[PDB]
Design a protein around this nucleic acid. Structure first.
Ligand SMILES: COC(=O)[C@@]12OC[C@]34[C@H]([C@@H](O)[C@@H]1O)[C@@]1(C)CC(=O)C(O)=C(C)[C@@H]1C[C@H]3OC(=O)[C@H](OC(=O)/C=C(\C)C(C)C)[C@@H]24
Ligand SMILES: [Cl-]
Ligand SMILES: [Cl-]
Ligand SMILES: [Cl-]
Ligand SMILES: [Cl-]
Ligand SMILES: [Cl-]
Ligand SMILES: [Cl-]
Ligand SMILES: [Cl-]
Ligand SMILES: [K+]
Ligand SMILES: [Mg+2]
Ligand SMILES: [Mg+2]
Ligand SMILES: [Mg+2]
Ligand SMILES: [Mg+2]
Ligand SMILES: [Mg+2]
Ligand SMILES: [Mg+2]
Ligand SMILES: [Mg+2]
Ligand SMILES: [Mg+2]
Ligand SMILES: [Mg+2]
Ligand SMILES: [Mg+2]
Ligand SMILES: [Mg+2]
Ligand SMILES: [Mg+2]
Ligand SMILES: [Mg+2]
Ligand SMILES: [Mg+2]
Ligand SMILES: [Mg+2]
Ligand SMILES: [Mg+2]
Ligand SMILES: [Mg+2]
Ligand SMILES: [Mg+2]
Ligand SMILES: [Mg+2]
Ligand SMILES: [Mg+2]
Ligand SMILES: [Mg+2]
Ligand SMILES: [Mg+2]
Ligand code: NA
Ligand code: NA
Ligand code: NA
Ligand code: NA
Ligand code: NA
Ligand code: NA
Ligand code: NA
Ligand code: NA
Ligand code: NA
Ligand code: NA
Ligand code: NA
Ligand code: NA
Ligand code: NA
Ligand code: NA
Ligand code: NA
Ligand code: NA
Ligand code: NA
Ligand code: NA
Ligand code: NA
Ligand code: NA
Ligand code: NA
Ligand code: NA
Ligand code: NA
Ligand code: NA
Ligand code: NA
Ligand code: NA
Ligand SMILES: [Sr+2]
Ligand SMILES: [Sr+2]
Ligand SMILES: [Sr+2]
Ligand SMILES: [Sr+2]
Ligand SMILES: [Sr+2]
Ligand SMILES: [Sr+2]
Ligand SMILES: [Sr+2]
Ligand SMILES: [Sr+2]
Ligand SMILES: [Sr+2]
Ligand SMILES: [Sr+2]
Ligand SMILES: [Sr+2]
Ligand SMILES: [Sr+2]
Ligand SMILES: [Sr+2]
Ligand SMILES: [Sr+2]
Ligand SMILES: [Sr+2]
Ligand SMILES: [Sr+2]
Ligand SMILES: [Sr+2]
Ligand SMILES: [Sr+2]
Ligand SMILES: [Sr+2]
Ligand SMILES: [Sr+2]
Ligand SMILES: [Sr+2]
Ligand SMILES: [Sr+2]
Ligand SMILES: [Sr+2]
Ligand SMILES: [Sr+2]
Ligand SMILES: [Sr+2]
Ligand SMILES: [Sr+2]
Ligand SMILES: [Sr+2]
Ligand SMILES: [Sr+2]
Ligand SMILES: [Sr+2]
Lengths: 160, 172, 337, 142
RNA sequence: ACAGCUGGUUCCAAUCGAAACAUGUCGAAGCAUGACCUCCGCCGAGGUAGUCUGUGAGGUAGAGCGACCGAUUGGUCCUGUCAAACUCCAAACUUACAGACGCUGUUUGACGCGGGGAUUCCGGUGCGCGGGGUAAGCCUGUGUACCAGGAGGGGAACAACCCAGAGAUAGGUUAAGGUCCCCAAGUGUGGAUUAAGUGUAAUCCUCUGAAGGUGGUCUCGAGCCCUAGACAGCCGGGAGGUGAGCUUAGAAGCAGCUACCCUCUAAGAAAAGCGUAACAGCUUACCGGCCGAGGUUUGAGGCGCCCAAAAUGAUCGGGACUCAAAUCCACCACCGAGACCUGUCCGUACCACUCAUACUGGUAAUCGAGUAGAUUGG
RNA sequence: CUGUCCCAACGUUGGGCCCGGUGAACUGUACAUUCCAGUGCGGAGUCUGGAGACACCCAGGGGGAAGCGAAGACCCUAUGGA
RNA sequence: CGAGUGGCUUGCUACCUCGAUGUCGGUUCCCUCCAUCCUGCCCGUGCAGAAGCGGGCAAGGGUGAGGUUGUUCGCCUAUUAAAGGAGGUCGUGAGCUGGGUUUAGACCGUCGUGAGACAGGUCGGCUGCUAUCUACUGGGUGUGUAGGUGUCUGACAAGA
RNA sequence: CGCCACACGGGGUAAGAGCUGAACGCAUCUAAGCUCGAAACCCACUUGGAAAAGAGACACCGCCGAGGUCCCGCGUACAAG
């Protein structure tokens, strides 16, 4: 199904699992990537991917963007490289689909999505100064797999 | 902006409207230099290219007019020389100048002669396996030299195997 | 998915209406090359016969062999170039300036024209020459007529007037060439303009077929099979779709067929002669006997017998001229039988 | 043939629409206007797109007809008509008292109207009406 | 014959003026009862559409959850997210009553009560908030204003978008909107941008244009380098120990492993990229020369460009427009309604006089549009 | 076996066309020379913008008048009928 | 995974028509679209050549004949440069056809106590009208430009 | 069902191949300029076309007479005209 059907925030907050049954599992494999034993303050450089428009991103788009971002970091910095990426948003919003005409139209559950407001951080990677241009490229691949336009903002780095 | 170009002693250049004529011992070249708010004039013995505007588009053309005039100065004195070499693998190619046009016969085994017309005062001299294109107007000479190489264009078959054709050897 | 098919008939000969002049009017003329000369002649259609010829074409495997070629016999007696019209280049195209006439007129030209009694050929000639000096002169054409009285099989004595161009050398030399033809008596023959073996363009007003339906007029199909027995035999399917809610002029409809001007291109002149060599036994059907100046045009020519056809050197020939073909035999067999 | 013009306008190096707008205003005020040198009249912009617009107008049509002039003679005349209510009595009289010409059929040199002239030294992106007509397929007779 | 169904039901004017909703109904194409419209009689001094303040009611927006609840990360306390059917919090706002101001009522009797007559119970659209649905000129709520039943002005046309609520006639000034022509009024002023005919399209089924890309161009900021000569280009040099060692038949900058050292010097790697079977060969780093003025890295903004394919004839209404007749920032003067101001008249209501509802005089900023329908004079 | 078809042609008889005589009907809110686009209850000769358009008459085949003909048999509805 | 364009499929909605806008398929005849099957000019190649594969510009012209089936669709054959797709009220019944859908007759299977039913199958089963307007194809009569004969011009228009 | 005829060539472009050339000393097919380049576009060719309201041009004849109509014999024409 296209994202056009689920990208906007038009329906109410439908997250209550005690009233919703048959919710598909999250396609998101990991949320903490890289070296999850080391701290965030141990790295000189902190670059985040900032979502420009208020959207609803599906778990499949979240997985595709994360997989195409971390796979570049596994390629350029190694499998056990000196970095750590974090996906801070979790898919809480349960999605429906009316799949009979318009009679008894309340749809059955087909998936999950994450509500991200404009200006928020979807991804945040902590790396060293030499690996700064590799992460800006991991986010360039990651923003092409989500719905809004994005900003690659450096929050801790006066090394330019 | 304003760029002043000192005219050589061998050269003397007149101007009317937007046209600039440059005369010398190797010949004469008349060109039209027309662009918004750029005035090209002859101040005694210097050529002045000036404009009241300093934007990238205006600046691009001032620099283009400079190189056009400097090239005309070189053309009417020392001239422009383009050297070429006629190479063939199996079929003996016959390059000959027939009138105001250079004709290439028996190219790649063709029964029909390939020909191109020479641009203006440009002279094409042949000495066996070598061809030398020359004249005062670089525009005319550069094109006539190019026309000769383009004349043996092959789009149908592999260029790496079928390498026959006159190629530019010397660029001025 | 319903098979594709080219549309019925051509749209280039439109509208298919009756011709204004029965005398054909050329819309194009040949290029100025060699010696100054009149760019066309005229005659009257006689009929058809065949001729045995020796193959002139160098590229043919049959070069030198006997070949039977169909031919249209046209009676071409001498014509009279009675005047010289001059055109001037105006910003609105070419406009007629003046005409230079004569004194010598054919006895029966007063059947069509209000023949000149008082004219000044010198003041007209002066006007044309001042225009040439000014560089305002366009082209030079001659007002020409035919002598149908010379043709016994054609009932009309009333001359057919038409304008013909003079092209060739410089505008100065052809002005003079034109004036020399006129100032004599205007008399010129087919020989003066054409040579046997050249490609000519024949213009003519076609055979009149009155009003005919779409099948004959545009070559549309007849109704096929079961559709042919219902009450519709030679009527098209529909006059158009629902939308656009109008009938387009492109749909094949009924109306006038024939009696239209056609300009048949690249017609080879087999032989130009005089006498009774191409005449058929018992005479040409619905025409008569030929005994005078004629032309033999390869193949068909527009219009019926007795109709005025026009000649012009081919504006767009495909082949190079192969002059004076060897005529081994001309048929004289009766067209009846 | 003679046309007693009150105002004779020189279209040479002048922006067509601006001249046309003024020639219309004058014709409705009862003036007998004559546009001269329309082959040399000008219209600013990218030649490639200007020609496309005019070529489309020539390709447009049906059985009812959409007669669009190819000559600069008629193009300027049609531009003036678009600024006049030619279907109304007052507007037709105004239009019929305006005539466009190729060159200058008069002795007098025409006047250049204010705000209509284009400085060729300041402009490169423009076209001459004659150039438009040559591209449209018209016979150059100027 | 009956029908809850379709069609039709004939003169003028004056006042007021809806409901398309609630409850019940073999009810949903219908009725009844309410809501609401109107008319009559009664009552006799208050009333409350607005605002402010006081005394109360409330858990929606937002927020937050080591505050409950239930979701929802990882690490050897820290670290990452959420909620229509969660809340330690918490608006705007809505709402009860009271006072005050305002407005209104006591000859125009308000508020209220009683009675007669209805119509109506297919609604629609805009905006705000919604719920369903991929969406819809969708379905179904709610508040509000409008269309219906609302003219006139503008918007190309166009129920509901903008101005505007309108007795007659007349003069004037404006509103929305507009001032190059069609077309009334500017080819107005100061300045900047755009070259795509972008654009000349408030709203919209109607006016598309996206993710992505852009040394197209304009503007603003930051760091670094530079006349001790920067950036680039061109010339010259790019050297020895030594072809490093190991590996290996060989490897000599450049298959691989390890080291990656010091002389000469103004530079020159235990070699950055090609190239060879391996050499050779070509440049890179690095230094010098010629030249001479800004250069380089990065950030932000403006307009435009690419992305961009549809059927009879292309379009901003059309013409057509380029230091604009586009766009943005300011500014100046105008055109332009039935609005507003103004003269006269008319109707209606009320006041004075009157038997009068006949005259006459007076008041209306706080009277003048109207479908169904109630009332009344002709 | 053949014109059913390729693929249509020519001919025959009666019409058709012109003249004398006889002489209806269907249909008609009005206006009406339209065409291309648009708009509008979303399928316009009539609204908007343009384009085109001198009037009248003859013959034609039927594109449009959501052509004329029948208060849709389909479908639903009616506290209808058989 | 993300962003779109189209309005050819299907679905949704119930705005328009129930005092009727004639069905599917086919046929005949006309116009168009491009997202191009061929033809022209091109770029790349895992481009030697030949034959190809992929891409670009491009709608001038072409894109055909047949076997089963009512079929649209599709399967199949032999040819071909190729035998592209789509819009025009799923163009086209005051043009045709009437094979299918969908009346009244009948049979079979299934379901039903039964009348009878079926988004099952099967045989049979009707095609109205003299054109007022408009539209176009062709043909005339007048008026305008303002006596006549003959010859022309060329704004525009059509073409494959 | 038979027979005859139905180009080439110019001009300007698209995709594309290039020249000269700057912004940016270099480089660069492009920004200004230029040489090329499609069965496509324009011309060429065929057909219509003085009702093109700017309603056209030329030559001769004529205004008491040029010419035309009716009539008559007929078709190269034709449903009336
Ligand atoms: C003369 O006939 C008509 O006009 C009809 O229009 C098209 C139509 C109809 C109707 O519109 C209309 O009544 C539909 C278009 C309406 C529709 O909703 C629908 O779904 C169909 C299947 C129609 C097709 C056609 O059907 C006819 O039966 C129906 O035809 C008939 O109903 C009847 C006819 C021809 C006669 C027996 C009266 C058509
Ligand atoms: Cl048929
Ligand atoms: Cl047209
Ligand atoms: Cl008008
Ligand atoms: Cl410019
Ligand atoms: Cl009101
Ligand atoms: Cl434009
Ligand atoms: Cl009264
Ligand atoms: K219906
Ligand atoms: Mg090959
Ligand atoms: Mg015979
Ligand atoms: Mg015989
Ligand atoms: Mg009344
Ligand atoms: Mg009254
Ligand atoms: Mg919330
Ligand atoms: Mg109503
Ligand atoms: Mg004005
Ligand atoms: Mg636009
Ligand atoms: Mg009914
Ligand atoms: Mg039934
Ligand atoms: Mg019953
Ligand atoms: Mg119909
Ligand atoms: Mg394409
Ligand atoms: Mg086509
Ligand atoms: Mg068949
Ligand atoms: Mg259909
Ligand atoms: Mg039809
Ligand atoms: Mg029928
Ligand atoms: Mg019929
Ligand atoms: Mg059957
Ligand atoms: Mg059957
Ligand atoms: Na259901
Ligand atoms: Na019949
Ligand atoms: Na139909
Ligand atoms: Na313009
Ligand atoms: Na046109
Ligand atoms: Na009843
Ligand atoms: Na209701
Ligand atoms: Na009810
Ligand atoms: Na009911
Ligand atoms: Na009070
Ligand atoms: Na909110
Ligand atoms: Na109201
Ligand atoms: Na309006
Ligand atoms: Na535009
Ligand atoms: Na009323
Ligand atoms: Na037969
Ligand atoms: Na019709
Ligand atoms: Na779409
Ligand atoms: Na649909
Ligand atoms: Na059909
Ligand atoms: Na094509
Ligand atoms: Na088949
Ligand atoms: Na239909
Ligand atoms: Na049918
Ligand atoms: Na039928
Ligand atoms: Na060409
Ligand atoms: Sr919603
Ligand atoms: Sr994106
Ligand atoms: Sr002629
Ligand atoms: Sr012609
Ligand atoms: Sr029949
Ligand atoms: Sr229509
Ligand atoms: Sr509330
Ligand atoms: Sr003005
Ligand atoms: Sr101005
Ligand atoms: Sr300005
Ligand atoms: Sr619409
Ligand atoms: Sr918009
Ligand atoms: Sr974008
Ligand atoms: Sr295209
Ligand atoms: Sr009133
Ligand atoms: Sr009232
Ligand atoms: Sr109109
Ligand atoms: Sr008929
Ligand atoms: Sr191809
Ligand atoms: Sr068969
Ligand atoms: Sr189908
Ligand atoms: Sr099938
Ligand atoms: Sr079709
Ligand atoms: Sr049937
Ligand atoms: Sr079936
Ligand atoms: Sr069935
Ligand atoms: Sr008149
Ligand atoms: Sr190019
Ligand atoms: Sr005339």
């Amino acid at each position: 199904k296209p994202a056009s059907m689920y990208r906007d925030i038009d329906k109410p907050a439908y997250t209550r699992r005690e009233y919703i049954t048959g919710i598909p599992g999250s396609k998101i494999a990991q949320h903490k990537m890289g070296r999850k034993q080391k701290d965030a303050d141990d790295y000189p450089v902190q670059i985040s991917l900032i979502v420009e428009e208020t959207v609803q991103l599906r778990h499949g788009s979240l997985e595709a963007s994360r997989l195409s971002a971390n796979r570049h970091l596994i390629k350029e910095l190694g499998e056990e490289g000196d970095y750590k990426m974090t996906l801070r948003k979790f898919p809480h919003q349960v999605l429906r689909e009316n799949k009979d005409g318009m009679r008894a139209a309340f749809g059955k559950i087909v998936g999950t999505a994450a509500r991200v407001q404009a200006g928020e951080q979807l991804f945040t990677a902590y790396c060293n100064v030499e690996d700064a241009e590799h992460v800006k490229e991991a986010f360039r691949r990651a923003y092409n797999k989500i719905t809004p336009s994005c900003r690659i903002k450096v929050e801790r780095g006066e090394e330019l | 902006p304003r760029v002043e170009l000192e005219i050589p002693e061998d050269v003397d250049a007149e101007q009317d409207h937007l046209d600039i004529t440059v005369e010398g011992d190797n010949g004469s070249v008349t060109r039209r230099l027309w662009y918004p708010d750029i005035d090209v004039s002859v101040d005694g013995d210097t050529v002045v290219i000036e404009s009241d505007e300093d934007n990238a588009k205006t600046m691009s053309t001032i620099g283009t007019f400079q190189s056009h005039i400097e090239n005309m100065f070189h053309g009417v004195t020392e001239g422009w020389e383009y050297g070429m070499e006629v190479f063939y693998s199996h079929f003996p190619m016959q390059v000959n100048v027939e009138g105001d046009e250079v004709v290439i016969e028996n190219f790649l085994g063709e029964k029909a002669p390939r020909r191109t017309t020479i641009h203006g005062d440009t002279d094409v001299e042949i000495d066996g396996e070598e061809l030398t294109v020359s004249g005062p107007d670089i525009e005319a000479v550069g094109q006539t030299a190019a026309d000769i190489e383009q004349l043996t264009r092959i789009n149908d078959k592999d260029v790496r195997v079928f390498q026959d054709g006159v190629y530019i050897t010397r660029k001025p | 998915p319903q098979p594709s098919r080219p549309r019925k008939g051509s749209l280039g000969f439109g509208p298919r209406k009756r011709s204004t002049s029965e005398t054909p009017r050329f819309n194009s003329w040949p290029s100025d090359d060699g010696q100054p000369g009149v760019q066309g002649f005229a005659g009257y259609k006689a009929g058809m016969t065949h001729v045995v010829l020796v193959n002139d074409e160098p590229n043919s495997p049959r070069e030198g062999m006997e070949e039977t070629v169909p031919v249209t016999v046209i009676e071409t007696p001498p014509m009279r170039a009675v005047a010289l019209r001059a055109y001037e280049d105006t910003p609105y195209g070419q406009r007629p300036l003046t005409e230079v006439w004569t004194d010598e007129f054919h006895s029966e030209l007063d059947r069509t024209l209000d023949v000149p009694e008082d004219h000044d050929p010198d003041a007209a000639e002066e006007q044309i020459r001042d225009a040439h000096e000014a560089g305002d002169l366009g082209d030079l054409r001659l007002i020409t007529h035919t002598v149908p009285d010379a043709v016994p099989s054609v009932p009309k004595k009333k001359p057919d007037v038409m304008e013909t161009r003079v092209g060739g050398g410089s505008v100065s030399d052809r002005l003079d060439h034109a004036l020399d033809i006129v100032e004599d008596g205007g008399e010129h023959a087919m020989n003066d303009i054409f040579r046997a073996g050249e490609y000519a363009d024949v213009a003519g007003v076609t055979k009149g077929k009155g009003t005919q339906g779409p099948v004959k007029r545009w070559g549309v199909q007849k109704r096929k099979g079961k559709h042919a027995r219902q009450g519709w035999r030679r009527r098209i399917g529909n006059l158009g779709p629902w939308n656009p809610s109008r009938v387009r002029s492109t749909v094949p409809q009924q109306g006038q067929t024939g009696y239209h001007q056609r300009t048949e291109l690249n017609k080879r002149l087999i032989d130009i002669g005089e006498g009774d060599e191409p005449t058929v036994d018992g005479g040409f059907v619905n025409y008569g006997e030929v005994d005078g100046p004629y032309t033999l045009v390869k193949g068909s020519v527009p219009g019926p017998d007795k109709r005025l056809v026009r000649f012009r050197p081919a504006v767009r020939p495909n082949d190079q001229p192969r002059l004076d073909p060897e005529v081994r035999y001309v048929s004289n067999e009766s067209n009846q039988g | 043939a003679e046309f007693d013009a009150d105002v004779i306008v020189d279209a040479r190096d002048c922006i067509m629409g601006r001249v046309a707008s003024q020639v219309a205003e004058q014709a409705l005020d009862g003036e007998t206007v004559a546009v001269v040198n329309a082959e040399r009249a000008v219209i600013t912009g990218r030649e490639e797109q200007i020609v496309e617009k005019y070529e489309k107008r020539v390709d447009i049509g049906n059985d009812n007809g959409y007669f669009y002039p190819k000559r600069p003679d008629g193009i300027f005349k049609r531009t003036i008509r678009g600024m006049l209510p030619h279907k109304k009595q007052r507007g037709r009289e105004a239009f019929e008292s305006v005539r466009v010409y190729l060159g200058n059929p008069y002795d007098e040199d025409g006047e250049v109207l204010d705000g209509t002239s284009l400085d060729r030294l300041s402009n490169i992106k423009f076209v001459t009406l004659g150039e438009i007509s040559e591209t449209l397929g018209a016979n150059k007779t100027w």
